[PDB]
Design an enzyme around this catalytic site. Sequence first.
Site, PDB file in Angstrom:
ATOM      1  CE  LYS A   1       7.549  52.054  -3.105  1.00  0.00           C
ATOM      2  NZ  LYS A   1       7.516  52.933  -4.283  1.00  0.00           N
TER       3      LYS A   1
ATOM      4  CG  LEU B   1       8.548  56.959  -1.539  1.00  0.00           C
ATOM      5  CD1 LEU B   1       7.109  57.079  -2.037  1.00  0.00           C
ATOM      6  CD2 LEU B   1       8.927  55.492  -1.280  1.00  0.00           C
TER       7      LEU B   1
ATOM      8  CB  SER C   1      10.999  54.121  -4.476  1.00  0.00           C
ATOM      9  OG  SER C   1       9.819  54.291  -5.234  1.00  0.00           O
TER      10      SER C   1
ATOM     11  CB  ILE D   1       6.599  59.301  -9.425  1.00  0.00           C
ATOM     12  CG1 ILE D   1       5.952  60.608  -9.898  1.00  0.00           C
ATOM     13  CG2 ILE D   1       7.871  59.565  -8.642  1.00  0.00           C
ATOM     14  CD1 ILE D   1       5.587  61.575  -8.772  1.00  0.00           C
ATOM     15  N   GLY D   2       9.229  57.940 -11.205  1.00  0.00           N
ATOM     16  CA  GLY D   2      10.495  58.202 -11.862  1.00  0.00           C
ATOM     17  C   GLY D   2      11.197  56.935 -12.310  1.00  0.00           C
ATOM     18  N   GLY D   3      10.471  55.823 -12.307  1.00  0.00           N
ATOM     19  CA  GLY D   3      11.026  54.542 -12.695  1.00  0.00           C
ATOM     20  C   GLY D   3      10.901  53.516 -11.592  1.00  0.00           C
ATOM     21  CB  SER D   4       9.587  54.060  -8.206  1.00  0.00           C
ATOM     22  OG  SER D   4      10.178  55.355  -8.273  1.00  0.00           O
TER      23      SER D   4
END
Lengths: 551, 551
Positions: free
Chosen positions: B149, B198, B224, B245-248
């Site tokens: 990434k 992101l 992201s 951090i949130g499903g990325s």
Amino acid sequence: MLTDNWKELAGKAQSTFQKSLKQAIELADFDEGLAKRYGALPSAIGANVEDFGSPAQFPLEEYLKALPKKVLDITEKDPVELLKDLKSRKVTCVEVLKAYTAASIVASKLTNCVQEFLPIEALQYAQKLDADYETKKHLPLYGLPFSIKEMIPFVGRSVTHGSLCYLDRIVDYNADIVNILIANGAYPFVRTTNPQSLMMLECVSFSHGRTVNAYNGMLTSGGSSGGEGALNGMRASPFGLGSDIGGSIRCPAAFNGIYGLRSTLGRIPTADYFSCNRGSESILSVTGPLSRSLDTVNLVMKTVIEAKPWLIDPTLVPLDWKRPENKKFRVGIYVSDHIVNPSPPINRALSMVTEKLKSLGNFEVVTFEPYKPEKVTEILGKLYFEDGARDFRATLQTGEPLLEQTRWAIEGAEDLDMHDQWYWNLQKQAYRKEFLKHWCSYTDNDGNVLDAVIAPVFPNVAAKHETTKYWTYTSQWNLLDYPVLAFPVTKVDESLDQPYKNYKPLNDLDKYFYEQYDSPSSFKNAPANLCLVGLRFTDEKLVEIANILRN
Amino acid sequence: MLTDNWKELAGKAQSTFQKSLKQAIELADFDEGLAKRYGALPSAIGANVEDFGSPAQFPLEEYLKALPKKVLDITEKDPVELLKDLKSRKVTCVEVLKAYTAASIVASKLTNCVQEFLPIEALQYAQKLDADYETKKHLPLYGLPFSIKEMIPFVGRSVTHGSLCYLDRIVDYNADIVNILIANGAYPFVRTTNPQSLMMLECVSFSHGRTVNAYNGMLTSGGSSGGEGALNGMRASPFGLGSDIGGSIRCPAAFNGIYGLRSTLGRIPTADYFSCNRGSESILSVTGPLSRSLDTVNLVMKTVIEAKPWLIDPTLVPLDWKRPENKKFRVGIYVSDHIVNPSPPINRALSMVTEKLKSLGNFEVVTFEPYKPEKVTEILGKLYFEDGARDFRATLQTGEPLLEQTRWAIEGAEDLDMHDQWYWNLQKQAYRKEFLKHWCSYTDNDGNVLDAVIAPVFPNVAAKHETTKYWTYTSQWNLLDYPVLAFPVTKVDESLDQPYKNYKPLNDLDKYFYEQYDSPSSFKNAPANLCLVGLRFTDEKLVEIANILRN
């Protein structure tokens, strides 16, 4: 003729096939994923010509599963539409060759329909067809490969019609029809399997083993053009050329759910093919195309005839290939000859097609009764092997075993004296004249003749091996030399196609075929085809009516 | 940061990519046939970063057709199997690089998943790895390239996480995990796209445009780590590193039908990545691999952890990567959080995986109920952007527009006073403690804890653009810091996945997602993935259960 041991010769045949298979795989250039899936396919090819392998239950499903979209996007496309892509340069001739070569390799392993691949000459044909794109783009079949029955001569090959004793019979020329098609932008890329004696409605020989149906691997491909029926049923060829003297084009086509035309004798050249009984003229074979696509059958016929083949083969008539102008049609339905009744799937197909024609306003539909169908067997029983099968039987000096199906065809054959031949030629021409009178008896009060008759190709869908013991539903039209087009209708339905209860057979042979149809599960996914029959040289009427039945 | 006008900067970003794309094509060394097909591919790259092009309907189908056997035979190979060929010297490190470079180029044009190629340093890595074959043959990832990434530091590059203002932020070092992977024989060869801020489950930025799904080009790649999901969904990288951090990590993996592991915080080093809100510790991101290959996911974790990364990163725990010895399993199925119900394709995936586990004797399968899932949004609503999004908004001083998805993530952000953060840190720790008690309430009478839960990754398969308006199915496990492995189950089936009839929505947000699923055809060929959730540090149980589910 050769007189070496047949086991050695079978070796030489297998080697020729295997060497071309190796070259075919090199040309197709499998990626490892396809090579793996191909390697793990159940094979209908054995270790030797008497070992028949372990065929897939549904070879077409295995074929469609095994091959990548990059191949199927070409081979599954209707060939007339593919001709547009070749013409407009959306695809190259070499690209099309690679796809169909790969398809035929997968078809060869599943159905055992290939006798010899032609990858060397096919690449030469396709490459220079690409190089000459600007000068040959206009040709009606530009860039299209096709299959040829092994009996059809091709430069540098043996022509054996499945007999091992002819493995040294090498020709330095192509058959006329092959050269004509090449002059029109096509080229052959593979030779398909043919059975012993060619007088079998199945496809077993000691040059290749056993060929099986494209839709159900426990059933026959049919014959005599069995490789063509299997290969084109699998859509692993755009079209193919077979031969038909007793049903040998229509039976493969019907068993594999595709189109097949027994064309009228004298329209397209076939005499330079090789068979048994060379020089026998009492009953003559014809050729014609097999294909998934009616449009492709029509285009092949149109292409060859517009090349005026009567200026190379003088047995042919200068009769144009012409769309019929009739908008109204009179059609008879031939439900049975009342000697062997068709099995449920064939009877349902007749009803389906009857109902569809009746629902269209411009079709009048009548019942068509038989005329002395017993006379078909009597005459063909004397004229098929008029030398008492001496010519065929001499092929077995190698020790090549006599197959059970071949046995039926040569049983009882008389070595006719000249007066015997004359007697039966008169029987042949009289029956032809009587049958024409029968056909014309169906002309209506207004004077409109019957345009076509719809009939079975066989008393059942694709037969179980060694059970094709009745020919009349196809050989009737060889005795008469009527053009006949096999066409698809439906597939066997286990709910709709249960055996008849309280059936009372018409005779011992009808009893045999009744007990043969034990349940539809024995014929899973088998296409139920019929055929359109016309008077001599009305080939085009048959194409036109089949066109209406598919719209 | 920078203060130049954003249009100039987007140009500079495009130039960097185009400069690296040019060098990549040289490294890949296309023959004319591929160069031709590559030139004619539909592009998801536009003329500018706001022009999203016209992507293919099935980018993967186009990819498999476009690339040659010379490339696919390597890139389609399972990376663990490919490592055997690299070890046994059946294939060269440079040979593998060339194939994957070519694959990523084709993938870049079809899905727009590459931000910058690294062909200069990749050729140096691969060349010396070949030279050092005898001494480095033993390394667990010898010769294998991988993708990273864009947020992951690499020597001499800008690290921007998609914000144009950071194009002058050059690092002279690699991320710890990168150096560890290099120490074990791997090397990065491409940098993948990441979106603005992101904080969206899609992949749109003003550095690259829009990244699309590998299976259906009308749908998002996810985010992201959207480039990672697309590139590894196209199998154009052996594996990649993302952040979550949130499903990325799990959302891209699930949308592209591959594996993605949100590993437990404290196992593998991630803190040296760059993001917004640097120094924010209230909610911490984690890293983890994405790959087509489960075996490749497991091997990267094993390789990194066995390198003892806690001797470079002191936030990490010295806990071995060990396959579990469990013979029985207790597993819960999370059918819904009863706030947003899953669409039919996900619902069928849950039944499929449920019926498969029940069919194995050693799994006890129970329904898993939610626990206050609304608190996930409330707490993450305060802690994701605890500075009121001041740090992110400062990136827009260049005039860089605010994307619609970014708007959702920063709307309502409070600039927390220290006491406000303390309040929500206590709320965070209380919820985690309450949830553990919830999980343990499923322990059976003999004391067997739940080993894993099977849950959706998202209320649907890959979303339509700008509709990822619900995070809880992934952010739940970021609030809890539980390891979660996304894994494939099935694809949309147009017969089976028709919309629910007589559906009564649970609330306005559930109604929105119901109407989003207008028909399965809108999501044709989109993968339906699920995920396995475990208690903290049970990552390996998830791998082992995923292993069973794919056999």
